[PDB]
Design a protein around this nucleic acid. Structure first.
Ligand SMILES: [Mg+2]
Ligand SMILES: [Mg+2]
Ligand SMILES: [Mg+2]
Ligand SMILES: [Mg+2]
Ligand SMILES: [Mg+2]
Ligand SMILES: [Mg+2]
Ligand SMILES: [Mg+2]
Ligand SMILES: [Mg+2]
Ligand SMILES: [Zn+2]
Lengths: 116, 66, 83, 177
RNA sequence: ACGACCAGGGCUACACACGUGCUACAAUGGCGCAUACAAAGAGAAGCGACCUCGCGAGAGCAAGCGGACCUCAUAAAGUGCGUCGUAGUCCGGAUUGGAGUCUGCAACUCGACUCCAUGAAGUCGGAAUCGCUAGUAAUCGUGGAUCAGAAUGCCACGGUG
RNA sequence: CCUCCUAAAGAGUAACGGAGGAGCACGAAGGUUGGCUAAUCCUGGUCGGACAUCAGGAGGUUAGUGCAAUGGCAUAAGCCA
């Protein structure tokens, strides 16, 4: 049960199991399933090998897993290189999308750091 | 090599999505079913598309048209 | 982000200035206030001093800067650190 | 053995064509492939080391040697003669088989594989590489394993220069960069 | 000039501390299909049906109507069937990347919304502390003002209870 | 009680002279047969870092000796079985 270079849980439903792949959420998974002709509710266990192959092929159509990750990294790196506002924010480690920083930026900032 | 200390080592058939049939000696025991192989793996095909640097100017041209 | 049917936004005066620069072939920094203005393909190579609210900071235009707007490359507030 | 056979007829010939070698014995050959698992976590509990050894065995049809501390170091909190790593040296037909597996199956299964390091050769032919996951080998079962672990592969060859070694590896359709 | 005009910036900064809220930590639930029952309001530089296109936000076309007539406008929790089976999960949605839509001379700083991806923390919270006695608490949705656009706020309205 | 120096190239040789150790350990750390050769550094190598484990080269005993110091030790007296 290996799709796009990663192992996938057999007991789970197909839609959700595909979501284990970095690059597909629910909608993408659904689309993949539609393309295949495979029912959504069926498990990864009790599939034919041909079916699995078809699924893999379908997955291959989208930029997924490592490929996607690298691309994501590149964009960030590009921004950093630019030294634009977003890039600057990224380098700082603070909210890019114009969120408040006075309070509540703990996702970017991590845990609270006491004053020495 | 020594008689008893070693794990069982016997020839198995390694099937693939390619159609490629690969008879290889292994410790697996059962018949093996692969996802990818050396001939299949998108090294030669993928890595040109997989980088995808591109350009901004062309993108700009495409969507606005002036 | 700007609507696609409307097309990209550039200030008229700034555009004219850019055109003039292109015609010349000069490499003197052009001091502008139009931060809201989108960068163009013809803008590449030029240095343009974007106003940051206080001063004009020179921005050497590159290939990657095109889709972006001018204010992005001109940091407004100056923060060093709390301690 | 298939790869050995390939070498015997083709790889050697290719090498001769390339470097313009005088003797057929002057040609490089892969002497040994050495597999090693460094397992520091073994000092806390013995079973982990055993598990690692088992994994190694599964990977490569030989039973591993259990290596011990050459000298005691406090920085890692180990004493001399402490069972700290495990090692397999492959030679002959088995080695060839392992090599075949590595390139035709295992390397392809590496997650986010965009090539192997070309500048990784010690300077005198002998290539070395390391895998982060042991599950890339189809010998290890994904469900059975409790602890994620890896190993280092060391391809030792007769090649005098690193360049020669590189060439040899290329002749064996080794991925590289 | 401590008066007046203008463009750009700031009022949205961020080692941190506090207050008031929203969303959660799941199964008295999530997700999917079907399906029932409101009230109170607003609307002319406005509310905008239907039909067509768009995955969608929306776009195009264009009736109606200063309105118990038309529009906003499908109530939602609920009910029925199915699925998930106690996992950091088909929980949770933060954050980020890409693609967009609309408003507006103009959305870089600094808008809202949509789609695809991404999937932090969080498993009911220390000392302490607040509200509420009935159609109340709790929970579920709906509308309005301010408004070009921009509410988890405020002021209202009904449901279950 | 042991080692070095003082000690004057045999031995020995004093001082409240200059330096250090012992009051054991080991049924293998003893016997023998068979095999093996060190420190350190550089380069490459999953986690892995100045420093574990694996390669290869340089290196040549600078290491080791159950413990002080001296004299020895590859025929190894060093390290395995
Ligand atoms: Mg304010
Ligand atoms: Mg607090
Ligand atoms: Mg957690
Ligand atoms: Mg409004
Ligand atoms: Mg004498
Ligand atoms: Mg004398
Ligand atoms: Mg001997
Ligand atoms: Mg002895
Ligand atoms: Zn294949």
């Amino acid at each position: 049960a290996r799709i796009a270079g990663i192992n996938i849980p057999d007991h789970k439903h197909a839609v959700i199991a595909l979501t284990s792949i970095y690059g597909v959420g629910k909608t993408r998974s659904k689309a993949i399933l539609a393309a295949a002709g495979i029912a959504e509710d069926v498990k990864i266990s009790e599939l034919s090998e041909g079916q699995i192959d078809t699924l893999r092929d379908e997955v291959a159509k989208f930029v997924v897993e490592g490929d996607l990750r690298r691309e994501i990294s590149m964009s960030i790196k590009r921004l950093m290189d630019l030294g634009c506002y977003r890039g600057l924010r990224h380098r700082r480690g603070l909210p890019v999308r114009g969120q408040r920083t006075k309070t509540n930026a703990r996702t970017r900032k991590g845990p609270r750091k006491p004053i020495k | 090599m020594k008689k008893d200390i070693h794990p069982k080592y016997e020839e198995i058939t390694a099937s693939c999505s390619c159609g490629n049939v690969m008879k290889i000696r292994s410790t697996v025991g059962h018949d093996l079913n692969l996802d990818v192989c050396s001939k299949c793996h998108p090294f030669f095909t993928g890595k040109q598309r997989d980088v995808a640097t591109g350009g901004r100017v062309d993108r700009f041209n495409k969507r606005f048209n002036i | 982000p700007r609507s696609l049917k409307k097309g990209p936004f550039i200030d008229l005066h700034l555009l004219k200035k850019v055109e003039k620069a292109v015609e010349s072939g000069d490499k003197k920094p052009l001091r502008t206030w139009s931060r809201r203005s989108t960068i163009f393909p013809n803008m590449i190579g030029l240095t343009i001093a974007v106003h940051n609210g206080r001063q004009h900071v020179p921005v050497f235009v590159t290939d990657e800067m095109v889709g972006h707007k001018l204010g992005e490359f001109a940091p407004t507030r100056t923060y060093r650190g709390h301690a | 053995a298939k790869l050995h056979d390939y070498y015997k007829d083709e790889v050697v010939k290719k090498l001769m064509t390339e470097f313009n070698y005088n003797s057929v014995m002057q040609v490089p050959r892969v002497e040994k492939i050495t597999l090693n698992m460094g397992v520091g976590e073994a000092i806390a509990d013995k079973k982990l080391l055993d598990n690692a050894a088992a994994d190694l065995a599964a990977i490569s049809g030989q039973k591993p040697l259990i290596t011990k501390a050459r000298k005691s170091v406090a920085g890692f909190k180990i004493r001399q003669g402490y069972p700290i790593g495990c090692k397999v040296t492959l030679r002959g037909e088995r080695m060839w088989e392992f090599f075949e597996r590595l390139i035709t199956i295992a390397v392809p299964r590496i997650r986010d594989f965009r090539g192997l390091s070309a500048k990784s050769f010690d300077g005198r032919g002998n290539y070395s590489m390391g895998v982060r996951e042991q599950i890339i080998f189809p010998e290890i079962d994904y469900d059975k394993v409790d602890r994620v672990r890896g190993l280092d592969i060391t391809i030792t060859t007769t090649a005098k220069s690193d360049e020669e070694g590189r060439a040899l590896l290329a002749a064996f359709d080794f991925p590289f960069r």
